[PDB]
Amino acid sequence: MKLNSAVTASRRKCRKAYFTANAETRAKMMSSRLSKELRAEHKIKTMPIRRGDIVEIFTGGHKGTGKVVEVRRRDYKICVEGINQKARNPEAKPVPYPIHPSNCIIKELYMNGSRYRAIKRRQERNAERLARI
Amino acid sequence: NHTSKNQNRKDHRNGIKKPKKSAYTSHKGMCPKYLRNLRRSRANDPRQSLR
Amino acid sequence: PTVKVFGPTGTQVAELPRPKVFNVPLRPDIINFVHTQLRKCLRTPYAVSRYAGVQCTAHSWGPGRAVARLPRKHGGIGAYANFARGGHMAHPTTVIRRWCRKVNLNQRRYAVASALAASANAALVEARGHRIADVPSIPLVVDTDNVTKTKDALAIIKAVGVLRDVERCKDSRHIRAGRGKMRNRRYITRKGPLVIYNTEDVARGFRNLPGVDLCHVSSIRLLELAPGSHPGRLILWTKSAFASLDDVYAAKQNYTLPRSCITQTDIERILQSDAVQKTFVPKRDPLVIERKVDPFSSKEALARLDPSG
Amino acid sequence: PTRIRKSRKRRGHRQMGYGRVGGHRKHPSGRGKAGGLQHKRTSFDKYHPGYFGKLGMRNYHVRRNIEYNPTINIDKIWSLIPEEQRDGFLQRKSTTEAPVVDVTRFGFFKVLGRGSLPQCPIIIKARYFSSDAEKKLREVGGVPLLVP
Amino acid sequence: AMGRNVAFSNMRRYKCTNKGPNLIKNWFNQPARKIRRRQTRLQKAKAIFPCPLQKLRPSVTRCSQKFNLTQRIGRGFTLRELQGVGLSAGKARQIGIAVDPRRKNKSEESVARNVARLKEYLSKVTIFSKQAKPEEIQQAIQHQGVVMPVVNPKPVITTGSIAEAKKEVPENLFMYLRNARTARNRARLAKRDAEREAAAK
RNA sequence: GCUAGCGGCGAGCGACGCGGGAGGAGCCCGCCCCGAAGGCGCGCUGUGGGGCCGCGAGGGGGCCCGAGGGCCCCGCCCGAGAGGGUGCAAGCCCCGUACGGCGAGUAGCGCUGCUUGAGCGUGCAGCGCGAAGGGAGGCGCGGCCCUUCCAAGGCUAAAUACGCCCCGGGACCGAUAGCGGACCAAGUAGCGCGAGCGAACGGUGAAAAGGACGCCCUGCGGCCGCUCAAAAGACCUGAACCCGGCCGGCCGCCGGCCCGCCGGCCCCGUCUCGAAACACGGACCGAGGAGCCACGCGCCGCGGCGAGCCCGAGGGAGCCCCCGCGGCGGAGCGAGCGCGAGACGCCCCGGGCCCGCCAUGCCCCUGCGGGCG
């Protein structure tokens, strides 16, 4: 259970905090599972979703793999290239079907440099925890 | 305004209550001289309750 | 009478005498009363705002305007009444209410003792709803050394017959049926064993096990001993807890345990005793009623009353 | 327990247990104990004797501690003595070793006599002793000593 | 109930119920108050870790003929009592003894009670000085609660000789007691009669 | 303590002292001694001294569903099965949680007024008059004591109270409720010259995918259909009242029957002696709407314990556990000084006696005292 009083366990307080959260917190909330292959390489269970990430949806209808073309933190959803609603008119511009990032597994990551620096900081912090704190 | 109709039916609902056994035989209003002498007669031989 | 102690392995490690609390007469009424009173004392006060419906300015318009005489605002809107929309409730709730009920110490102790005693009755536990078929003995006394891992505790519980009760709790979690879901009370699970621990640091190991609760012999809780004002909870005593029960229950100033009583079976055996049956005298044979039929009409019927006729 | 209440059962009856010819109205007998010398004299005379008037001398301040005088009967003096000591004392008797009980130390200042002491002699110490108490303890062969 | 036999209520009518100062004092903060006082107490204890939180206070007869038999704890030791041990007031305060110049013993037995209490405390107290002595300070153990808590001893029966005891008590003690009690009234009335006798001839 | 008192002694009003606790801490000036030693443009008309920052476990297959978080089999992590989110009800999908790190115009007194439970004054005040060793001790006055203290100068922590605001919890309310106000714009829109008053208004869907096309129409708009699981299409469900089509009857209720005939039926509520009343209220329907709580009292039932009984406030790395005073009862009665119950008795009830109070008569010590009738 929770032994800390500072964190709220109220449904009302929790939903308001998620529904209206700062963008820094929206990022962590919008994390996604690193693949078995990536996890072995980087030693991090889940990394926050980015706009160059290629991800494989594993539950929702539309279970394919694509790059993340757009991230809309306000809608708490990400848009994956190639997963769209059926464009009624054939000669029409596609509308992306937003997928939640929980429903996805990160096949590839946009390596960047800050991503690499962030991956390392966790690797040493997790090592302190693995050293039984 | 004054009227006593239904008084007798109300009185006889469960009435005609007799006075009580203690009332018939009581030491109230009796001659004080009779009462004093009665206590002395009682206070001797079997009737005496004195220790 | 000594209660068998089974170790984490599950095999009769030692024997311990029965604490005399388990000889206390089983009173369900004393338990229910103190349970009801102590649940009320935990209740947090609720009330409406004193300034609700009084914040507006409304005056009865008055007779003659063809409108009912209830306070109405500038517009002519009904206000300030239990029947008016936006009005104060006729008797507003206040926190001045008595949310707590006092209990005499003796009566509280009598209840706590009769609840621990109820745990010993084999059927009381099954009646309450615990699954106790695989449990070897009641009370369950298990010598478990300090346990800090759920898997170690789970093995103890599996090897002593309580896994089915823990599984009844695990597979009983559902969303609630009311506004309580919204009011931070969304999930309800079935209540399971109570592990009484003395100096055996098994609290960390057993805490996340589903439905199971822990309580130091220093402070047994009657709302725990009888969940739902229904006594009969499987209690997995640590061996220190049983060996300390005669101490805990004597350290109560000069509190003397309520004297043992009788049971319906022990009133039935007493009733069937030869002396009681010998006193019984059979009664007179009863009356024959027989609904009236016309006697005059039939020859056989008339002969019972008028044979010569 | 609101559920198990007379008012809830009487819902559906209109007047709610208060009558039709006379209805519940606000204070129709006046508020408080009022009119006890006028309209309610019947009740006040019948059940309240001595309610109206002044009957005694007045002490502007009452000093409870000095007006406090706790009393013990001659029957409970032996009860104060602990049982283990008391049971032997009664068989042993003895003028030299007669029990001394300072009822003041137990918490009582004056000894009254309501019952009978046991025959074994006892010395009682108290601030005051009723005459019947002095006589009874003197009959049991005891001494009514005073205490400071 | 409605009239009939009811003792009259002596509870005063509520005042300032709608407007005015709050005359209702709720106690839902009571459990929280308990945790607060312990937390303030724990913080204070650490600030003077070797020293007991409570200062030594004196045994004092409880006032009135009602409680004159028992003893309780008073504000401070009298200057005479401290002088009997040999401690000046300021030196005593450093040791931990509270000092009250106002109190007067009122007896010679009261002084003896407290001088003995002061003597015992002096033995129990250990003065940790020597600049810093951390090892001794670590195992110092802070005394918890009231220091030397007063003990009120229960009455114990004693053995006495009826013959010697009957020597002090006059025979007919009640007459002796009732005469002493009424002597003032009897004496005044007989003086009142002497004036009447003087005022007849 | 809850009653000493106060009050057309009426209605009502009403402290403190003990006792148990939390908390505790003592001092300083004037006066007087020095006399500038001082804070030195002053001052000898006296200065100075005596909280943040983190990591963070472990789930697959089958079937189906618009989509599992569903089911059916098997597993794994719990110092984490508190919660929230995610296309349905998720310990293992995401976040988190458990586990971490860094003393004089005075006192007094006279007269008045206000006030207090304070009563021939509880404190204050005006004016008049005014001390010296004084104050008090709860019935005034004048003596005599006895206990206790030193007013007319000043400081002082702690324990206590409490809103905005922030944080957390709730046997709280669920949009006519809950704050007036859940709505990106509420003290807002509006109103009153102004002081002031003061609303209404929550919900599409998982994703706007918020409507492909064609047909026509002078055109509007309609029509198909489309998207979607569904139109859910300006929105969740969509009741009652009320109304339009189409179909079916001739009809208020109650009973018998095949069913439109016979029989019976005044309009409720409400005051009232009496209502169908030419008494009153009621167009209709929906939602809301009225003996609740606190405290005191009387009595009853129960439960614990019993000449006892008692979660008082509080205090115990203590949580519903433990320890924990008054009080109330056990003795009454009398204005009070005071004095002070045993003799019976299943129970009840009378009688008899005992205790106090009001007398009376006797006897005698430690005497208006005691005892006895």
Side-chain angles (χ1 to χ4, degrees):
Chain A
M1 26 234 138
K2 205 188 24 114
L3 310 173
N4 187 22
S5 261
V7 223
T8 146
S10 294
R11 153 165 279 251
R12 218 243 291 213
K13 280 150 171 332
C14 285
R15 290 174 33 100
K16 180 204 70 184
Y18 157 83
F19 269 108
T20 20
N22 50 286
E24 183 79 36
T25 321
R26 304 213 170 209
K28 212 31 202 155
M29 274 154 172
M30 282 195 15
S31 287
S32 197
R33 171 73 79 106
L34 274 208
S35 41
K36 226 18 219 288
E37 13 141 292
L38 274 192
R39 271 184 86 186
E41 189 192 341
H42 304 290
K43 287 96 171 287
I44 292 142
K45 190 212 216 136
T46 142
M47 244 242 133
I49 251 285
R50 226 221 75 114
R51 216 201 22 243
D53 287 4
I54 285 102
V55 273
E56 189 239 329
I57 303 126
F58 60 85
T59 148
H62 305 284
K63 260 159 297 265
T65 327
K67 198 143 359 149
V68 181
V69 269
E70 189 250 6
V71 164
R72 21 173 118 259
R73 283 124 149 231
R74 328 181 122 263
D75 205 32
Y76 268 113
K77 263 133 175 47
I78 93 214
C79 293
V80 156
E81 150 246 337
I83 66 137
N84 320 288
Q85 355 241 2
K86 157 225 279 173
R88 331 147 38 112
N89 188 250
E91 336 278 83
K93 227 244 114 242
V95 173
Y97 171 60
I99 188 66
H100 197 249
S102 120
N103 308 322
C104 311
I105 275 216
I106 327 208
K107 263 40 227 17
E108 273 147 301
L109 274 166
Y110 181 91
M111 262 327 146
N112 220 340
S114 226
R115 153 140 308 135
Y116 263 132
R117 285 191 308 275
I119 273 178
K120 234 26 97 87
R121 288 169 356 208
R122 195 150 339 171
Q123 285 211 228
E124 312 158 33
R125 287 147 142 174
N126 199 30
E128 297 186 69
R129 164 136 213 274
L130 284 190
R132 308 277 42 83
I133 260 127
Chain B
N1 71 79
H2 149 73
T3 262
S4 59
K5 245 113 165 19
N6 194 59
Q7 255 34 253
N8 213 22
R9 251 220 343 177
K10 266 176 61 202
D11 295 338
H12 275 103
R13 280 297 228 280
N14 48 288
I16 320 299
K17 283 338 213 150
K18 275 313 134 304
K20 229 117 64 87
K21 276 204 309 210
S22 58
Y24 281 85
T25 146
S26 175
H27 288 179
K28 175 75 130 173
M30 287 217 64
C31 176
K33 288 198 134 180
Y34 175 86
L35 293 181
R36 264 118 71 165
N37 124 89
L38 180 67
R39 285 177 281 243
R40 315 163 192 155
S41 0
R42 293 298 184 93
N44 253 302
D45 292 50
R47 321 139 291 273
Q48 117 219 337
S49 274
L50 345 146
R51 26 122 52 241
Chain C
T2 148
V3 198
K4 0 185 109 206
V5 180
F6 320 99
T9 133
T11 36
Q12 211 122 333
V13 160
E15 283 316 295
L16 237 55
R18 161 170 315 269
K20 278 153 250 351
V21 212
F22 294 94
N23 299 305
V24 147
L26 242 75
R27 301 273 302 273
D29 42 285
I30 300 225
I31 290 177
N32 167 68
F33 161 74
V34 184
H35 180 282
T36 289
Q37 271 27 262
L38 277 183
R39 233 180 85 230
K40 286 152 161 264
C41 301
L42 259 64
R43 185 173 34 162
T44 320
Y46 62 87
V48 290
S49 172
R50 24 147 343 147
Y51 293 118
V54 208
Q55 262 177 123
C56 86
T57 100
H59 314 300
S60 159
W61 267 17
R65 337 175 85 153
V67 284
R69 315 173 314 199
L70 77 131
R72 286 179 198 275
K73 304 167 157 134
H74 195 176
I77 310 122
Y80 257 113
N82 43 297
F83 44 94
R85 152 212 203 267
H88 50 78
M89 19 171 344
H91 336 283
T93 51
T94 27
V95 278
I96 325 178
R97 197 209 300 256
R98 271 174 32 95
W99 304 96
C100 295
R101 297 277 168 281
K102 323 168 240 194
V103 216
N104 295 10
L105 182 52
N106 264 26
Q107 243 159 143
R108 293 212 292 282
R109 290 173 155 164
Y110 200 133
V112 168
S114 174
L116 296 151
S119 96
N121 213 6
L124 258 261
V125 201
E126 233 200 309
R128 230 235 29 125
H130 297 270
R131 308 274 169 270
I132 50 130
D134 277 23
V135 165
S137 96
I138 11 244
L140 207 33
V141 203
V142 35
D143 176 67
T144 142
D145 220 348
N146 305 352
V147 158
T148 66
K149 282 289 137 344
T150 39
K151 12 166 8 141
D152 204 14
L154 262 163
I156 295 178
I157 249 162
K158 200 159 136 68
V160 83
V162 203
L163 187 90
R164 256 197 84 173
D165 203 41
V166 176
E167 229 58 66
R168 156 188 154 277
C169 310
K170 165 137 192 189
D171 307 331
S172 77
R173 195 181 185 244
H174 49 269
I175 318 231
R176 217 190 288 275
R179 214 73 218 101
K181 295 162 4 272
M182 154 76 211
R183 278 162 207 200
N184 330 320
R185 257 168 267 135
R186 193 151 268 250
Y187 296 96
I188 149 99
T189 184
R190 269 178 221 196
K191 276 321 232 23
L194 182 59
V195 14
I196 305 295
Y197 67 101
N198 181 33
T199 334
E200 269 141 311
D201 273 328
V202 301
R204 327 219 243 97
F206 282 94
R207 66 196 197 202
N208 231 51
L209 275 218
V212 341
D213 2 71
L214 284 123
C215 249
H216 205 284
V217 227
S218 98
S219 29
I220 345 237
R221 276 165 133 73
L222 168 73
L223 305 181
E224 291 261 42
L225 284 166
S229 90
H230 308 322
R233 163 163 245 192
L234 192 42
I235 290 161
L236 258 74
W237 298 86
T238 62
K239 204 233 250 199
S240 220
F242 229 50
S244 95
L245 243 220
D246 260 338
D247 305 334
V248 147
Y249 251 96
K252 311 281 214 205
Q253 33 207 44
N254 346 277
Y255 179 61
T256 320
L257 263 341
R259 269 189 128 257
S260 356
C261 277
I262 24 103
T263 95
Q264 183 261 159
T265 79
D266 252 12
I267 256 318
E268 262 356 273
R269 152 203 73 108
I270 276 191
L271 252 160
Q272 279 316 112
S273 298
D274 29 86
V276 204
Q277 312 280 301
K278 270 187 120 212
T279 68
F280 297 168
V281 272
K283 289 215 7 174
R284 58 125 132 227
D285 270 26
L287 183 58
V288 266
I289 320 288
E290 196 175 311
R291 322 189 71 253
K292 166 88 58 154
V293 261
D294 207 89
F296 277 105
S297 49
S298 143
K299 227 156 347 198
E300 57 92 36
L302 196 41
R304 311 178 72 227
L305 281 161
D306 210 10
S308 146
Chain D
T2 322
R3 359 101 138 234
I4 43 123
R5 266 216 191 95
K6 199 184 137 268
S7 50
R8 308 270 340 158
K9 335 259 177 226
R10 249 124 287 247
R11 229 114 143 170
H13 296 73
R14 194 203 136 81
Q15 324 98 41
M16 294 274 287
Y18 278 97
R20 282 195 196 253
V21 212
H24 189 139
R25 306 217 132 153
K26 322 274 158 218
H27 314 100
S29 39
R31 302 203 182 191
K33 346 127 194 234
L37 258 201
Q38 285 270 299
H39 44 278
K40 297 180 194 138
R41 208 190 196 114
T42 23
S43 197
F44 279 50
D45 280 354
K46 177 146 188 96
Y47 300 111
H48 280 278
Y51 183 67
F52 286 111
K54 286 165 91 152
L55 113 117
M57 332 176 358
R58 293 271 204 258
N59 194 343
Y60 298 156
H61 191 52
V62 142
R63 350 259 153 152
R64 280 150 277 216
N65 298 298
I66 309 154
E67 295 177 27
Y68 177 71
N69 246 258
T71 52
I72 201 225
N73 289 294
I74 240 341
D75 46 37
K76 274 148 96 134
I77 317 256
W78 269 86
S79 122
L80 299 182
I81 310 192
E83 205 74 61
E84 324 282 274
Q85 336 220 147
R86 139 171 41 147
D87 297 334
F89 260 137
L90 304 150
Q91 62 94 38
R92 89 178 115 262
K93 316 280 242 73
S94 162
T95 133
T96 85
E97 275 198 38
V100 166
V101 36
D102 186 14
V103 305
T104 304
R105 267 215 138 93
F106 285 88
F108 317 96
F109 292 171
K110 178 172 181 167
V111 171
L112 308 176
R114 216 204 350 176
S116 266
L117 290 133
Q119 337 284 323
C120 163
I122 172 173
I123 315 201
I124 311 167
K125 327 261 295 309
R127 312 240 200 257
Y128 208 87
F129 285 87
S130 131
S131 64
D132 277 23
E134 193 228 333
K135 171 189 42 205
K136 284 165 201 234
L137 172 62
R138 218 104 210 211
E139 268 156 6
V140 118
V143 184
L145 263 191
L146 295 165
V147 101
Chain E
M2 177 240 272
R4 283 305 168 88
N5 214 354
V6 267
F8 282 150
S9 151
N10 232 16
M11 162 221 39
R12 306 279 72 89
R13 299 176 142 181
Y14 299 137
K15 285 119 119 3
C16 303
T17 0
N18 177 262
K19 84 254 204 203
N22 216 223
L23 286 197
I24 327 120
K25 176 217 187 46
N26 276 290
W27 282 66
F28 298 129
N29 71 308
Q30 190 200 18
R33 197 179 330 171
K34 189 194 241 249
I35 339 265
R36 208 242 321 272
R37 259 104 121 266
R38 296 203 245 94
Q39 256 42 254
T40 329
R41 218 171 275 117
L42 253 118
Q43 289 342 281
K44 217 233 148 162
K46 277 194 303 288
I48 20 119
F49 172 67
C51 324
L53 285 124
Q54 243 90 272
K55 281 183 144 100
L56 189 73
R57 311 271 166 179
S59 272
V60 125
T61 257
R62 310 210 207 147
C63 336
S64 295
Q65 185 62 286
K66 176 156 180 231
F67 314 101
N68 226 31
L69 358 125
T70 49
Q71 325 282 319
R72 58 147 145 100
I73 236 168
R75 136 169 232 95
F77 287 78
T78 302
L79 285 199
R80 165 141 161 169
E81 310 183 315
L82 298 153
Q83 142 187 345
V85 120
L87 262 183
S88 116
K91 311 190 327 238
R93 290 184 215 272
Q94 295 177 261
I95 310 271
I97 299 125
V99 169
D100 190 32
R102 244 178 328 235
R103 220 190 112 229
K104 307 284 178 275
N105 307 321
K106 264 124 226 256
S107 255
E108 331 264 13
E109 359 269 286
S110 148
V111 202
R113 222 200 284 110
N114 291 317
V115 157
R117 256 188 79 94
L118 252 158
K119 270 167 178 17
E120 285 171 58
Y121 183 65
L122 279 195
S123 355
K124 308 303 121 237
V125 93
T126 323
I127 302 286
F128 288 81
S129 275
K130 226 239 230 92
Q131 302 280 297
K133 236 340 261 120
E135 158 237 33
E136 288 299 305
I137 258 117
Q138 278 145 39
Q139 52 214 344
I141 298 309
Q142 187 161 12
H143 183 41
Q144 303 293 331
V146 23
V147 187
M148 300 188 41
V150 181
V151 262
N152 262 334
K154 127 259 184 60
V156 193
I157 309 298
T158 353
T159 47
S161 152
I162 56 119
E164 148 81 63
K166 248 156 204 198
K167 119 158 48 140
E168 328 163 30
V169 138
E171 197 38 71
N172 229 260
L173 172 82
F174 188 68
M175 227 192 113
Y176 181 65
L177 274 176
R178 238 332 230 187
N179 259 304
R181 185 75 138 283
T182 55
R184 168 207 111 164
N185 291 54
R186 285 197 286 103
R188 281 165 182 200
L189 239 33
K191 146 182 210 177
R192 199 248 331 177
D193 277 14
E195 308 324 293
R196 270 221 33 110
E197 284 287 90
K201 308 309 287 165

